[PDB]
Every structure is written in structure tokens, then in C-alpha cells.
Amino acid sequence: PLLIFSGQSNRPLAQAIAEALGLPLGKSTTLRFANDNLFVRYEESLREGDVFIVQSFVPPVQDHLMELLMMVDAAKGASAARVTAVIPYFSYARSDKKDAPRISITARLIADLLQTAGADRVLTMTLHSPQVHGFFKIPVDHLSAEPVIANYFATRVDLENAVVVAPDAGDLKRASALARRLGLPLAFIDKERVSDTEVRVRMLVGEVEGKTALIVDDEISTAGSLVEAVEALMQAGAKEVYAAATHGVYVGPALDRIAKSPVKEVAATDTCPPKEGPKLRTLTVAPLFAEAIWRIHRGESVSSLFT
Amino acid sequence: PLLIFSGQSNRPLAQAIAEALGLPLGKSTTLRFANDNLFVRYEESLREGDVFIVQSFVPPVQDHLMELLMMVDAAKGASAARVTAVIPYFSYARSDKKDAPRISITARLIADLLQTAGADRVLTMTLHSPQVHGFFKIPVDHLSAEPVIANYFATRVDLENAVVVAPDAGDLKRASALARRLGLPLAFIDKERVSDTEVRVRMLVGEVEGKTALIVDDEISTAGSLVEAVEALMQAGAKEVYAAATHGVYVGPALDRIAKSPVKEVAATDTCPPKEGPKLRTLTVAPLFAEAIWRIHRGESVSSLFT
Amino acid sequence: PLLIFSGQSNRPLAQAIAEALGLPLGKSTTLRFANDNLFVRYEESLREGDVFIVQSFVPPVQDHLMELLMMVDAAKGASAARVTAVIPYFSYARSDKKDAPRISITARLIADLLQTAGADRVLTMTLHSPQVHGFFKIPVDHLSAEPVIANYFATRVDLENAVVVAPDAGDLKRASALARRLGLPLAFIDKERVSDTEVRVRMLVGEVEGKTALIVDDEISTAGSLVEAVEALMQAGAKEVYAAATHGVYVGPALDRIAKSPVKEVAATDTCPPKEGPKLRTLTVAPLFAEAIWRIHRGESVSSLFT
Amino acid sequence: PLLIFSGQSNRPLAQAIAEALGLPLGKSTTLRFANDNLFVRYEESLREGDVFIVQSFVPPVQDHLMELLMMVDAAKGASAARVTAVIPYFSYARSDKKDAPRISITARLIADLLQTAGADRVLTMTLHSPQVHGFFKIPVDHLSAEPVIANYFATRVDLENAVVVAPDAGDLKRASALARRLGLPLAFIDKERVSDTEVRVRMLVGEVEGKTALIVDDEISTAGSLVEAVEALMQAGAKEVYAAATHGVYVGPALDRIAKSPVKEVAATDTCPPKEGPKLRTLTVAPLFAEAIWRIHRGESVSSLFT
Amino acid sequence: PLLIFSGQSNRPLAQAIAEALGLPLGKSTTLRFANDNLFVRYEESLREGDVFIVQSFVPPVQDHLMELLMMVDAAKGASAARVTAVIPYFSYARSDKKDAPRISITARLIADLLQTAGADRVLTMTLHSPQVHGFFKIPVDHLSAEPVIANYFATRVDLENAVVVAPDAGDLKRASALARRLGLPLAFIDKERVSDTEVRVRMLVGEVEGKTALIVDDEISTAGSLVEAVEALMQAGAKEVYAAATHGVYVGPALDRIAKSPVKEVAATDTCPPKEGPKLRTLTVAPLFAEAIWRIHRGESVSSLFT
Amino acid sequence: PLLIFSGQSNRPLAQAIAEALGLPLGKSTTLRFANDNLFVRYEESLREGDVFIVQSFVPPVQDHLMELLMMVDAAKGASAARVTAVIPYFSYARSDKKDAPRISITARLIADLLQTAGADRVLTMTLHSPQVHGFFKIPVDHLSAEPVIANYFATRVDLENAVVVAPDAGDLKRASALARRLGLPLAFIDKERVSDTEVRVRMLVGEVEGKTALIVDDEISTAGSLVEAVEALMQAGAKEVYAAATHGVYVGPALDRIAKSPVKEVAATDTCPPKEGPKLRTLTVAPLFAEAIWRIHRGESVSSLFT
Numbered sequence A, B, C, D, E, F: 001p002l003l004i005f006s007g008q009s010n011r012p013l014a015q016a017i018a019e020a021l022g023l024p025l026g027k028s029t030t031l032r033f034a035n036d037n038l039f040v041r042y043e044e045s046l047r048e049g050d051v052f053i054v055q056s057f058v059p060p061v062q063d064h065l066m067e068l069l070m071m072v073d074a075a076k077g078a079s080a081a082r083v084t085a086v087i088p089y090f091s092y093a094r095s096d097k098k099d100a101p102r103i104s105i106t107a108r109l110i111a112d113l114l115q116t117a118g119a120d121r122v123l124t125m126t127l128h129s130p131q132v133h134g135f136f137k138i139p140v141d142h143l144s145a146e147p148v149i150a151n152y153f154a155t156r157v158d159l160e161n162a163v164v165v166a167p168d169a170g171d172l173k174r175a176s177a178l179a180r181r182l183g184l185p186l187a188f189i190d191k192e193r194v195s196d197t198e199v200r201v202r203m204l205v206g207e208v209e210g211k212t213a214l215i216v217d218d219e220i221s222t223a224g225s226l227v228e229a230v231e232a233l234m235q236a237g238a239k240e241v242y243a244a245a246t247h248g249v250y251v252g253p254a255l256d257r258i259a260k261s262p263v264k265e266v267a268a269t270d271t272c273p274p275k276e277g278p279k280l281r282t283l284t285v286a287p288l289f290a291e292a293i294w295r296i297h298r299g300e301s302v303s304s305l306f307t
Ligand SMILES: Nc1ncnc2c1ncn2[C@@H]1O[C@H](COP(=O)(O)OP(=O)(O)O)[C@@H](O)[C@H]1O
Pocket: A091, A092, A093, A094, A095, A096, A099, A170, B033, B035, B037
């Protein structure tokens, strides 16, 4: 008995997911009382159901976290047989280090909050670091967006005379995996930035001058990393720059910084509800999440989607 | 080893609690990133400390809840010997029953969340129902508002042949304790629904005509319950109506509904930050919380400040 | 896979539950050694079964509690797929507040004990307060007595221009539901203390003189609360008084106090075994429990038997 | 802050324990309501206390179990720093095997019940099997009665021409340890009993005929094992028999079977409240429990009492 | 979906179990990096599978323990519906008491390690003591080797003038049962362990006279107990000595000591990989484990194997 | 009472830690029976002690892991007030992701095993990745080896024309910090692991030109990364290469490959017992661990070591 519900974060994705399998979104309501307190209710019976609750960590984030936790709790209190937290974008995966003393490793905290709310498993996509998987004791199915991102580049850009680029050192793994998949060279643009030598503006590594540059990242939030990588690419010689990421968070001055940038096109998935933009394009992962949910429900191989 | 910290919900209350036992507020910063994700940090060492974190559940409540959860988690991660969640107002205390099918008993969920975050105890004032205590496995010290509410009526009303009233059966327990510490007789109301229709066709009990009314309630949110009773009292007789509660929540139409109603004065503690109104007196409970905290730190009887 | 078992507390109720869904009572024996230690044993395999264990908290309650705990533990040790504690009467539901310092909130303790013993869910009828639900992490299905109590008043009283009364504010919720399903108006009492002095100087509300009284309460233990209201009703007017409750506990001076009081008839379910009296009618709820159990086993809406 | 409390099982022992250290029994009350439900309350503050609660598993056993669990729970709810279950006799240590299918390993169940009630440790004496220690995750200090039993035999009996006897095979370890300590031979009397051969009455092993026999066991409940070992000893030649055990449970027909037996004297500790008997003698372990409690409180070596 | 896998400890047993169920042995890899760290990987999906993992605690024991824990952990992380640790020989069942202060009750520790790795059940054979069952909260199915040992003795030995011999008190239960099974008389040794390799016979009990002695024990490790028991039986007049044990561990000097001893034949099961010796025989428990697994998967009675 | 103990992995380090605190090394025994099972025993009382147990994960790794778990378990069973697992080298920190499907995130598993054995804290040095911290719920104090490595380089090398080199992206944070500490420039390798023994350099980034290259890494295991990095630096024109790592594991072909390489000197700490080589140097971390332990015991700031 397969049931899908949505919070308020990304109902279009959740609707599209359910639709992909020929299922409706299950009926649930969440209210906000005058004192700003949340309330959650399922209209129909969840009893003995295999239930999947879709929520992304987009603004307002803390209302969405709590709605997810409450919906998970209520589903177990309503006698669901199994409850899966479907979290297309887990923003707190960025809070995965104790990089300053006396902070919260918030990703781990949220993993434990989810577990005590009653979640039996998680379904997610492109965690900020792969180690976040280890913050959960419950099973996590961690989906890749490489297939849709690779398809976007192979179909939209022109890969004759092209290179995939890593601006950060932490980007190298994902950019290398795309380069092998697309049959393209890899290049790097200096991460320091050379705070001593003659050439103060970014130093280059690999052939870029004539070529069309391809940037892959996990997410775009303020677009600050994106915009500075593109400017460095252009002054280093490059003809044009295309960008892709899994999570188009697009927050603060992101849209305007992208518009002002000479980047040609920026592709993101619909893990986060997409925003209006002439240069913004969205690659849907609703059929991918849907096929994962179906296989989780039926005990079919999820990893064979990516192998 | 006694350290005290505040979230963003009621820093004045915590500053007063701190000054009332001769200690400074501990340095802690809580940020928001552009993506609306919280970040918490303690500036000083808390190692082997007996730490108390003050947060009331005021708007925006989900950010305050999450910040509390993070601060408790970060304090245990920073090797605090003990951490107490000082929650002056626990708003989700009202979500204590499963009165609709397939909802979250959210007060219980939050107790569990606090515990997995790492809280060793709770210090709180005037919970909506006495059964909420049993939602916590950890010890909760449950401060009473009766002393400071009685010493307001005594110190600046002074009405012989007065009467004291409850808006709710449930707060009858509170109005059968004030009432009769002052030495007056009784009255009360009991109906639904605050989340439905207008305001509100009621049922009253007691002798009020040649008598002057005092109201005792746990909290005032929308002030509908307040205005209902004031209208019902000051129409079948009744010279004048005064009002008292522990939690001055004051949201939605409340501040305006107080001015429009013939109620003389409304009394609230500073569990929630004070909101400015014409006839709106607020009673500091910072000395009471500071005394409870001093006793908790030293292992002295906290029960002794009730009797 | 549907198996049903009883302790020693109310084998008749469980026999009727079993016969009402066409299944035999499962064979289980519980012994006492000379040293007063319990011993529990299942005679048949329960392996991968959906097992339901019926025990009410009747005298001697501690032996019945322990036998329930042992039977749940032994059922999980025997590899039951699922075990439900069918608790028709949960007496410790009354220990739900910390109204005295340094006591046990015993309802919570017992929920925790049941869970560590291995109970996956609880099936119960008419808990003393609705907050007890929140003492369980596991799902509790909370059966209502209103249908069978209404269908007693309708089927064998038949009083036009009658009135319906509550002994307790708290059971006002129950008397604001019966009341008005029948179509009569209201009345209620509210005071302390059953564990103190005689019986009992009270405070009543409503119009009773030219009207005939019905009483609705959660339970009747010593029947003091019953006799108090019957005396208070049948003295300021009132033709005749009838009585109804879910739990026919009937201990101490109760059976005698019923005969001595001018109350016409007392109605109770068979959650506790029936005690023989002159005007003492008992309403079988075995068909209702059997229907709830059938629904739990098959995953059908248990909420649907409330509406 | 060292505090000792007692349940109803063995207040004289608990009083003597506290007295041994120059401390009073702390003030606690336990009531039984008319419905047979328990209630527990501490009169004084336990806050930040190192609290020890003394209870033996003697009839009525299930009331005593529950009283212990409730007292442990209430002590943690009253903010004790540490709570130790002092269980001088743990009768359910006999329920330590799954020797028939589909039973409770009740000793393990009770260990988990104790832990969820809130016990931080256990202090006990002569567990029925040493493996019961492993049923607890919390620390258990397991005291020996060999010093007091050895002292009894060395001072009361006359060890010239004496032998210590094992009737059961399971007795051999404890009887051997006493034999080495007293400088006596060991003997055995057949455990089968030879269900085939010529001599149907018990077969002998080791020299018994002229000698005075000494029986040691963990406990005496019905005295059935004791009485049959003594009769076998007399018909096998023995002059006289003395018996000792840790736990004088003395239940059912124990007292009369001992009186009818030619056993000269039967010694037991006061872990269980002793019963009246001319041939019964009690060896006090109150000073031993007291010195253990003192050392647990102070972090001094408990095992050096026995080394 | 029934799925069987193997660690490195006893692949031939796992293979024989799989083949008796009509199934392939699931594909698992275990690697050791140059730093001596282990790595496990399931080659194909085990999602929603009923997973059985076979591992005996034979040398190298800690590698085998860790591999089992990792395989259980990886099975749960890969979304197994259920995982059973099939442990034919649980060697640490000998670490079942605190018989010196400040040691680990290692059997209990391992039970808890297994549980936190994610094991839902255990299937094992001939635990050293019957209390070890109680160290596990998760269900354990405990198989007897008595039927195959009895089938073997009926095959190989003349049973006209035979007697079954327990080499110590701890084994008396198992030997007794074999006696009652085969309709033979019973005898036993009181054993005193002085070291890991050296033991001593305190006394022999029962009619040996001139019989064919059948020794049965749980395990043979160094064979010190076996060969001392053989010597004791022979110069007590026995005709000949046959030996059987469940666990043929055969370490240290065992093989040499079996060769020197006049014992005619030593049979053990293949819970542990066998070792070559002229007098050594091995009985396979693959069919019994296969049948138990078949029944556990289908929810049929496992006790029915031994009754 | 501060108490230090050692497993078998690195007794010289534990001894040096103890001696720097002015304390004896606590008496522990670890035995291996003939069946390869471990046994631990503390010789003297550690009751109410602040217990620190030193164990590195060096070969034989699984024996050392199990010994640590047993020692932690035995410490708790022997009534330690607190136990800290001091793990100078946590080798399984490399098992921190699911980079193939159906593996164990072994670092997380071990974190949970440690917690269930009863560890209250961890003290460790230079974890392979900064996310491993989040695998532990219990507090972990994570010591940097950077101060001693910097003190060493300032001692042994000419720093006028030097550059610090990270041999992979995962180590860039640590190398960067050393650069900023010593006021030197920074360079790094993009590494591609092909097997446990074999790796490849994809690209070198930064100004080497004709400098004295200082490699710093977390660990040296097979030295494949070290020697590939050395070669890459040399035929990129570097003058000379010095290397330092925290963990000198030195397994497989490491010692031979260090001898062949033109690297001048390879320094590692003594987290792992050192191995003899002409170019090998070892820096002791006993004073730093001792100071951390001293501070943990006294509740003084541990971060203050590295700021
Ligand atoms: N959940 C979050 N959302 C946004 N920013 C965060 C979050 N958690 C941590 N940060 C910030 O991000 C930085 C940590 O990431 P950083 O180490 O710079 O990059 P990477 O995560 O790629 O290694 C810190 O400066 C911290 O303040």
C-alpha cells in the first residue's frame, strides 16, 4: 500500500513524483496557528501503509524541518507500516564538520531528530559530502544527478573543444566523474589564491583558452562561487562558460549575479522549487525519485539506476 | 561551573535572570546563512559546566525551537557536565491530546527531540496541562505563577467583596488555588472552539452581580477567551473586570481586542517578551527563575519555593 | 496469523472477543510457584503471528501487570511478528499528573515498561484523561464507550425532557458529547478529595428540578463520586437518577453504597469482570474489541468505528 | 549526600543497614488505593542525592517489584544524582533459562524493567546463578555470604570429623569453596537417582558414615531439597546434619518440613525477613550491605571485602 | 526472498546449508587492506530480503567477529528486510560470568555488539551455558546437536552395555537428555579447571563397572577435559570409551592428546571446520541448520525439530 | 582519581603519557586462550575513577579493536565514573563513505560499537576526514599534530625557499593550515587511487620551481601516495623533498619505497609504534596527549592547545 505525501516545500515535485507512478498525492493538511505553532493532519487512513513524505530544506527552513518531523511522527502515530523521509535537498548536509569549536554538527543532529520522530529510512539526492550518509543509522538511499546533468551537457552545449572545470579543490571528484562520462579533459583554476607570487589574479591548470568551459557543482546558493569561477575562466582565455548543479537554491543575490555574469546557461534540478530566469533551466528528477520510491516499495535494485 | 545562555526569543528575561544571581550572560552567537539555515556557536568554554539555556517558544517559534535544539546539542558537544533547557513558555504544551485522528501529539514529540538533542532537564513555568510533565523522561522543574499573580492583585487592586473567575474548566484548578489564598469566592466558563466561527456564545457559573471580577488563566494568545469572559461577566451584573495570566503571548487580534474590551487591566509575566499596550502591566519572573536555577545548581529544594 | 490470548484478569471478556470473530482462545498457562513468583508459557507456536494479549488492571493489579509484561516478553521471545497489549481498563491512567512532589507519574512508567517488555501497540477503552495517549511512543488505539452507553439509555430508559450530568469537569468532555447525541441538556460537578474525609460537600450547575437525571463518568471505583452526585441531584429537585460508566471497577464500599443510594440503575461495560448487584446492568464490549482487533490485523480504518 | 530508603519487603534489614552507618532511614510512604493501585512518595528532598533503595523479592512479590520500580522512577523524577537498587534477595534469578519453549527469561526482563525505571546500578547477594550478572547492562555489585556462613560453621558445629555435602550437581561449586575454606573433605549424594541398578535409594560418594554433614545452598524455599538431602544423609550412615543458606525464603510447608526433619540447625541470612523457628538461626548481613553501600558511595574497593 | 551468505570462518558449512535449501550461496567479498583493516561488500542486491549470515567464532576469532558485525551492518545498510546472525559455534559463550573481579562478561558484550550492528535474530547451536540466551534481547533459536549425536551412536556403537558420561557439572543437563533419549544409564565427572590447558577430576559418579562409556560434551577445545575423563573412566574398570561433542574446536595440544588417549573415536559436528585425525569423525549439521532456516523464513515451528 | 591504562597496541606511548602526568601506568592483563578468544582484567580498583584507555588501530587491528571494546566494557562493569577511549590512530576513519553499494561505513559502525561497550568520550588525533567526528554521539576531542610537525620543520629544514605540499585534496585543509602557520606558500596534488598499494598524480598545482618541498599528510600506509608525490615534485624542478605525517603506519612495501625515493627524511608521530629506517624520524605526541588528558580530567580548555 504505497502512499506519497508532501509538505509545503516542494509540492510540485511531490505531485510530479506521485503522478509519474499514476498515484495521487495523499491528503494531508498543515496549519499555522496565530501563535506560530504548527499543526499537521492526515485526512485519509495511512494504516499499514508504506508512506513516503517529500520535503526539501528550502526557506522557511525551520518550519519545513518541523513539518517533516511532525508528519513523520503523525504517520507512525497513525500506524503506518513504514515511513520514509524523502528529502530531495538536505541543506544542512553543509553542517557536517566541527570546523570551529563549540558548534553543532547539525546534519548529525537532524539525522537523530529524524530517527526519533520515527523515520525508518531516507531517500535523498547529492548530499553535500558523501560522509553525511554515515550520520544516519537508518538506511539512506542516496541518488545521483550525474545521468541528468551529463545528458544536459551532451545534448545542449557542443562538446567539440570543451573542458569540464573545477574552481574549488572540493569540486574535483564530481568534475572528474563528469569528464570521464562526457569524454572530455579536466581543468583546474587556482584555489589559494596565490597569495605571494607575481600573477595575483587566479593561476590556470590545464587547457582552457580556446575552449567552452563546463562547471558542475552540488548546489548553487548565493551563486558567489559560480560567478567568481566564471570571471576567472573568461580572463584566463575561455570562449564561454556553462554551469550545472543538482540543487538550484538561488537565494539572496543569486539571480542578479547570474544575470550580470557572462555564463551562458545555468542548469539545476527541481530538488528545490525553481525560480524565474531567462538563463536558468531546470532538469527534472521527479521520474528518477519516482522510480526509486517504486523500487524501495517493491524491493527492487535502486543502485542499478546508476551502475 | 554555573553558566547561563539565551537564544534570540527572550534575551531580556535571560539578562535579568543572569543579573539577579550576580553572573554575566554567557557569550553565544546564532547566525542565519543566506539559505535560511541556522548556525550556533559558544564563544567561551563550557567544559564541565552546569549550563542553562533560556528560550521561550515565541514567534518565529520554529527557529527558536531549532536554535534551542542546536544550543543543547552544541553544549553537550562542548562537554558540558549538565544542560538544562530553561523554557519559560512552552507553547506546544497545548498540543497534548490526540483530539483529531492522525495528528502529532506535538508536546511529546518535542520532549523526545529535546532529549535526543541532549537536554538533561527542563525548567519551565505554568504548562497548559499537568499531564505534559509525563511527556518528559528527563526531570522537569515546574515553576508556579500563583505567588506573583496574587501579589499583583493584592499590591494594586485592593477590592473587598470581590470574586475570582476562570476562563476554562482545566484552569479551574488554578482558580481553585488563587482563590482561595486571597480569600474570595469562585466563578468559571467552559466551551469551544478558538479555531472556529466568531466569539463565542458561553456558559457561566457563580454569583457576580454585586461583586467585582478577577480573571486567572494560563495564557492569553488571541485574547478571544479573555474578551468572551469579560463580555459574559460585565453584562449579567459585575462592576469591573481585571485580568491575569502567566503567559503574555499577545498575537493576532489580541492587542486591539484588549483596548476595545471593557476589561480594566491585563496582567502577564515576562516569560514572553513584553508587548506595549495602554492598560498592560507585566510582572518580572526573572528573580523566581534565577532562584530556581541557583537551587538546581546547588542541589537545594526547588519544591520549597512553592510552599 | 491472528492469535488471541488472555491473562487471568478477565478471561470471560477475552473469550467473548475471541468467539465474536470466530477464533478459539490461544492456549497459555500462567502459574505461581510457592515463593509467589509468576511463570508464563505459551502451549502453541506464535511464530510470525499477530498476537493480542488481553489484560485489564483489576485486583490483584500488580500480578496482572506483571503477567501482562511477561506474556508480551514471552511472545516476542517466541518470535511473534507483532504484539498488541489489549488493555480494556488501564487503571493507572489516573496516575497522570505530578500533583504531589517526588511521586511516580505511574501511567508513563507503565507505558515505558510495556515498551521494554516488547509491546508494539496498545488497544484500550476510555482512558481517564486524553493526555495519557502521549505517554506511549507506540501506537495506541483508543476505543470510545459513547455508542454502547447511548444505546443503553435509548434502548431501556426512554425519558423525554430528561437531563444528562457529569460527576467531574474533565468528564464534561464526555458529557458534552452524549449529550448532545441523545438531544438532552447538561449538568456537572467538580471538587476533591476521594482520598480524604467523608462524602463530600459539592457544587452543581444547570436546571434539574422538573427533569430526570442521567450520569456519565469514565469509571466507578469506590462509588463515592456516584453517591455524591446522586445525593446532590436528588435533593434540589430531580425525579429520578440513572448512572452510566465505562469501567465497572466496583471496589471497597461501592456495591453496598449503590444499594443504599436512591440511584435507579448503574450501567458499566465488561472491561472489568462483572460484579453481581441488584440494580446493576452490564454492557458487553467484546464485539467492539473484536471488531477493532479484526481491523488492526487487516489494516482497515479503526477510526471509522468512532464516526 | 548518602540516602537510604526501604520498601515494604524488609524494613528491619534496611533500618539495620542505615543504622550500621549512623544514618536514619529516609522518609518514604507507599499506599495502596481501594482499586489495588500503588502510590509512592518521598517526604524529604532526594535532590542530587546518592540514593539506595532496599527491597527483597519476598511475598507479595509483584507489589514489591512494582514498589521498587516506582520508587526508582520517583527518585530519578525527584532529581537524585544516582539511584541504586539494593536487592538483597533476587528471587527471579531462578528464572534465568529458557528451559521450556515460549516462556519469559524473567530475570532478564526484570533487569530491563529496572533499567527503564531508572536504576543506575544494583547491589545484591548470592544470585541463583552467576550468569544473572550478565543480564544487567548497569553495574551490579554481587556480594558473597561465604564469610558469614563459614564463620557460622566454624563457631557453632564442631569441625573435627566433619564433611560438607552437595545433594545437587549444581551445588558442587559452592560446597567445594566452603570445604576448602573450612579445611574439610567434600562428599556427594547421587543426583539421578540411579533409575536402573540394585540399590534404588540414593547412592553415596565420599566418606559420610561417622561424620557430621554440612549442607550449603543459595536458598531454601519449600525446604524440599533440604529435607530429601538430610534423609538420604541419615540412611547413608551420617551422625548429624547441619544446613546453611544465604536466602531463608521459608515458604509453603518449609517450617514444618524442617521441624519434622532430623536436621539439627538451619542457618540463613536476613536477606529475607526471618520466620519463627526453634531450629532456625539467622546470620545478619546488614553490616556487610552497609559497608558495601558506604564503599559504593565513596569509590572504595568492594571486592576486597571477599578477597 | 531467502538469502544466505558466508563469512570466511566456515564457507563449506554455509555452502552445504545453501545447497540443502536449493539455493546458491550469496556473493560476498571480504578484503583485508595492507593496514589489516577489513572491508565487506555484497555483490548483488539483498533489498527486502530475509538475510542469513553464517559465521563461527574459530581462529582468527576477532577477524571473524568483526567480519560478522560488518556484514550484518552492511546488510541493514543495503535494506535487508531482516537479518539473522547464524553462529554455529559461539565460542564466547564460555565468557558468561564475572568469576574474577573487573573482567568483561564478553558473551553479553558481543550480544549487544551484534544488536547494535543491526542483527534481528540469532540462530546458533549448543551454547556452553543455558543462561547465554538471556544475554540477547533479540530472539535466539538454539538448536540441539543431540539428535545427530544419537543417530551417530546408534550407528557406530554397541548400546547393550553402555553408559553416557558428562565430563563436568555444566554438561550434566545435555548428557542426561542423551541418556533418556537412548534409554541408557548416566554418569558424570566433577571437574576442576586449573588452567586453559590443564584440568582435574575431583570425583566420578555412577555405574561404569565394565561398560562401553559414551562421553558427550558441548565442545572439545584443548581436549584436557576429554582425556582426563577417558583416563578416569578406564582405571575405574570401563570396557571402552567413545566421545562426542558439538563443537570440534581442536586447538593447542588437542589432536596429539586424542591420539595418545585410548578413546576409540571422537565425533564432533562441522560447526567448526574439521581437522584431520584417524580417530576424528565429523557429523554435518548443514541439514539441521537448513531446516531451521527454512522454518524461520516460513514462520513454521522450530521447536518441532526436537520433540 | 585520574587512571590511565593500555591495550597491547602501543604500550610505550601509554607509558610515556602516564609518566608525563606523574602517574603509574594502571595494571591491566590481556590474555588469549588457546581458542584465540581474548580475556581482559584490571588488577586493581578503578571504582569512581576517571579512566583513560589507550589503543591504536595497528596490526593485529581486530584483536586491538576487541581488546579496546572489552577494556571499556570491563571498566564500566567495574564502576568507573567515566571512561574515555584514547585512540591515537583511528585507522577505520578511512572507511567513512559508501563509495560502493552494499558496504559498511565502518567508522560509523565502530563509533556505535564503542558507545555500546560504554565509552563516554573519545580522545584521538588527526582523523582522516573531518566528518568522522559526526559519527560519534559521545564527545570527541580531536588533537592536531600540526604544532609538533611545525616545531620539527623549524628545527630540521631551511624554510627560506620552502613550500608545503598536500598529496591529495582531502589533506588540503591540514597542509594549508601548516602553510599559514609557518608563513610559507602552498601547493597540492590531485590524487587518483587505483588500488590499496597503487595511486596516480592527475595534476600538480602551485609554485615549486626550485624550492625545498615540505609534504604533510594525515598518514603514510603503503607510502604509494608519498613516493608518487615526491617524484611529481622533483621532475617539476623542486630542490628537495621533506615529508611529515601524523600516522606512521608503514605497512606492505612502505619502508622499501621510502628508501628508494629521493625524499630526504620522513617524520611521523608515535600514534603507531615506529619502525626502524635511516630516513625515518618520530616525534612523540605523549606530552600533547598527556596535556589533553590532564585538561579533560580538570575541565580546562582543550582547544587552547591549538590557538
Ligand atoms: N548549513 C549551512 N548552510 C550554509 N552555510 C554553512 C552551513 N553549515 C556551515 N556553513 C558555512 O560554510 C563553511 C563551511 O564550508 P567550507 O569548508 O567553506 O566548504 P566545503 O563544505 O566545500 O568544504 C563555514 O564557513 C560555515 O560557516
